[PDB]
Amino acid sequence: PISPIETVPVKLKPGMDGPKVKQWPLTEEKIKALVEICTEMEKEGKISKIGPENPYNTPVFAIKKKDSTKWRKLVDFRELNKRTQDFWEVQLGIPHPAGLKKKKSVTVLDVGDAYFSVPLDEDFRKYTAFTIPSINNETPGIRYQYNVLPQGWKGSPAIFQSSMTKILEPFKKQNPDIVIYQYMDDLYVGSDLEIGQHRTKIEELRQHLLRWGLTTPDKKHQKEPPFLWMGYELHPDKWTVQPIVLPEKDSWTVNDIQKLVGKLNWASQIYPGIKVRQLSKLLRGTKALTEVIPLTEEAELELAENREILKEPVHGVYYDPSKDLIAEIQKQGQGQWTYQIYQEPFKNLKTGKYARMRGAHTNDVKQLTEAVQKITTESIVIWGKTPKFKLPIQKETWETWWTEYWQATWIPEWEFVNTPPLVKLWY
Amino acid sequence: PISPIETVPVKLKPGMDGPKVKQWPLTEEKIKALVEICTEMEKEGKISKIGPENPYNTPVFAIKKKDSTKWRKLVDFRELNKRTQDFWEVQLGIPHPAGLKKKKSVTVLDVGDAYFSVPLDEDFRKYTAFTIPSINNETPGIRYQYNVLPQGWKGSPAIFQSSMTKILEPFKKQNPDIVIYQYMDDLYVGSDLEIGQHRTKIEELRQHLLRWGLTTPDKKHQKEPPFLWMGYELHPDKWTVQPIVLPEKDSWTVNDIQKLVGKLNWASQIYPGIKVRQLSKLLRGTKALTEVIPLTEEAELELAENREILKEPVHGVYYDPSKDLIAEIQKQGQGQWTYQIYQEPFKNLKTGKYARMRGAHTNDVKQLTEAVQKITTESIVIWGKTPKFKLPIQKETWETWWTEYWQATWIPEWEFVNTPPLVKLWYQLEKEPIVGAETFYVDGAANRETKLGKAGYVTNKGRQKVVPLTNTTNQKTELQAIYLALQDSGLEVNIVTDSQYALGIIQAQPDKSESELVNQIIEQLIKKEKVYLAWVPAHKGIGGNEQVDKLV
Ligand SMILES: CCc1c(C)[nH]c(=O)c(I)c1Oc1cccc(/C=C/C#N)c1
Ligand SMILES: [Mn+2]
């Protein structure tokens, strides 16, 4: 806009220094993109060009949010975050409503565009610096630094939190049962209204924002449903399952009781009381593998009992909010992916399984990235904080292609993994 | 002379104050020699006499490294740098030729006295203080400080290029055609016009720069086509590296080998075939710079294989943004792959190799993928895009491995090439056991301390066997075992192991390996008609193990 607001002074952590992260190499297509986007921002004052006395740097990517005919700039403030909002997790911490996961329909609104109005503390600016790349190293990166609260930076919501709760006030007044969590550029309006009335209450809210603080969200559909139209409605209350299910069968064999003594034996690590010596003893012999054998009646009390210790959850499993959440995903096959979200080995706080298209646009990567954004968003709703993904995939391939099907404005933390061995039998 | 450019303001790391290091006098003949130069310097404005207030100091030196003519000034600024704030990394990369545009006329330009031509942050000058010594060591002191980018300071190359860019901005805009790579003191101008108008633009540029203290080659763009540049032979329609001569002795040391291999890689950009598995496969666990390293048989042959290649000359072609980038890969053998990128079947934009991970049992498919990956990255850095791949693998052999493979993988678009060897699966394991198949409950176990072991089995059909082994390990034995099951089993077999490790290895499908044994095994899986390996828990879990775990 054109309104000089005072500037919330920002300080990084104790004896911490700005981020100096390498800017990954992009496609000419994407350079060209960013180039224009920035050429514009500079034109709107949102950003500025720097000199070489700015040692700092944070990576930038180009993506398409709503598939749209045009791109979005996605700055990866992941490092600058740890070096700041982690004291803008305190100095300005945003509290997480433990009941939003409880609503029936959580819709998500993009508000990151409010920020662009608040000028950024001059002394901090030097840290928001990013660099638009060159191809084959001809010219030197184009250098920019922010003059307004940036987007991927968690210091932005934090600072805005004031203007926000204000705007959202003569609305939580009216609608008091709706819960509204703000996590970065995303608003998370949750309700219990009937699918459609809710969808209405949203547009209601959405129009309020626009009416009130000029804060603009977005229109999903153009009121035109091409059989391929959404809006982003989440339904948390229906988020539980117990995928771990011993097989159900009439006739068993050595191979079958065996593969079973395995998965079962291995569950012991995660489920307190389940021994299986009387069921497994039925194997102590060197019988053929195809050989069919009936399940001892005596032992079957274990299959029975265990079949049941696999209906009722674990115990000493609580949420440590000092610890960070870890999400392990496994390639399942035919477009299906299993995932656990834990904190301490074998004490999961949730388990799911994405899948969206078996063999059409079936591309390991695209799937993985979409599953990553799902697992994320869920947790952002359940615990108000994103996990760190142990991703089953080659570091470089991932680094090359994630930006391809990514549509989130935030980015989590990840690391690549050795191999899910006997852990695949979690289907 | 000095430019009207504004100055990049510099600061010293937090809390640090300028450097104070007094000058060690000596060689009074030099002592005047400095003042001699320094004078024609302050004259030109590069420095200035300073009142004894606010002084600091850095070591002043005078030397003559050449065919004697001019004594030269030297100001080791280390302790100064040590105190100067960090800057923006200067392009610590080099425009790779493979991605340069076949241009019509190309001119290079040696900006003279670069650093000196650009001023220095008014309030950071103090710290550039020094002092030429006394005639007699009684300190009359000749005080000076820099008003330009001091020859060896930290923040110099940065701010130089910083200034170079700004300066070139209007021009690169007043004439959008002309391309200009800038590197250090050099300027590489490229254009698609006639030597007449190209030569005329230079002058424009050349004179535009001079309006900002930047002087250029007076012999009107002194260009030496082709240019020996950063280890590259740059012609206006081909590129290479000339000084590629690899030495032959009869006594090689860790050091000599290093140098050799390095050179051998560099060659790779363009010489189809350079292999290197053998020579580097020598430098291990031992990092003794000057230690006598006995050349190996393969090293000698590989070194020989490279010579015949290198012996002959091979050129490179530039990039046509108009066509499509094609990259093709061929598999050498000992875990080696080579490839080359093109747009024309005889031409080549660049070439290169890829070597397997250094330590694991791998796979020709995974590798082929690891390769396709490498190139995709390289390709992005150089040209701006990805290339179409021509791979020695059938869409069916691939889609089968990724659909089996526990890990995500997205290989861009490729087409099949029938040029062998052909990547493939040398054996698939049965998903469900074999009815009518013999069941071998294999097992191993070695004495860790005594280094002795045992590998054996016990079949359903009553057949047993316990073979002794020496210098083995829990794992060695646990494969030693399977190998046994496959050795005594009929064309169809079911094997049961208590070791995820042994399983896992095989389960991977390695076709080659640095493990005589695993090869002993791979070779036998292939001969089999149908193999079913399955895993059962170790000690508590004791299926048919009650029999194996014991004896063995
Ligand atoms: C002649 C090669 C060339 C090509 C193919 N295309 C260009 O646009 C330019 I400028 C080039 O000149 C260059 C490129 C890289 C370095 C130099 C400087 C040479 C030296 N010393 C000149
Ligand atoms: Mn064993």
Swiss-Prot record, chain B:
Impact after mutating L187A: 76% loss of DNA-directed DNA polymerase activity. 60% loss of RNA-directed DNA polymerase activity
Q: Give, from the UniProt record, the effect of changing Y183F.
A: 70% loss of polymerase activity. No loss of polymerase activity
- What domain of life does the UniProt record list for this protein's source? Viruses
Outcome following mutation: M184V: 58% loss of polymerase activity. No loss of RNase H activity
Task: Indicate the impact reported for Y501 to A/G/H/L/S/Q.
Answer: Complete loss of RNAase H activity
Compartment(s) of residence = Virion
Effect on the protein upon substituting F440L: No effect on cleavage between p51 RT and p15
Q: Where is this site: Essential for RT p66/p51 heterodimerization?
A: W401, W414
| Outcome recorded upon mutating D110A | 5- to 12-fold decrease in affinity for dTTP substrates. Strongly decreased RNA-directed and DNA-directed DNA polymerase activities. No effect on RNase H activity. Loss of pyrophosphorolysis (reverse of the polymerase reaction)
Q: Where is this motif: Tryptophan repeat motif?
A: 398-414
- Region RT 'primer grip', as annotated, extends over 227-235
Result for mutant: D185A: Strongly decreased RNA-directed and DNA-directed DNA polymerase activities. No effect on RNase H activity
Subunit structure and binding partners:
Heterodimer of p66 RT and p51 RT (RT p66/p51). Heterodimerization of RT is essential for DNA polymerase activity. The overall folding of the subdomains is similar in p66 RT and p51 RT but the spatial arrangements of the subdomains are dramatically different.
Question: What is the protein name stated in its UniProt record?
Answer: Reverse transcriptase/ribonuclease H
Origin species: Human immunodeficiency virus type 1 group M subtype B (isolate BH10) (HIV-1)
What gene is behind this protein? gag-pol
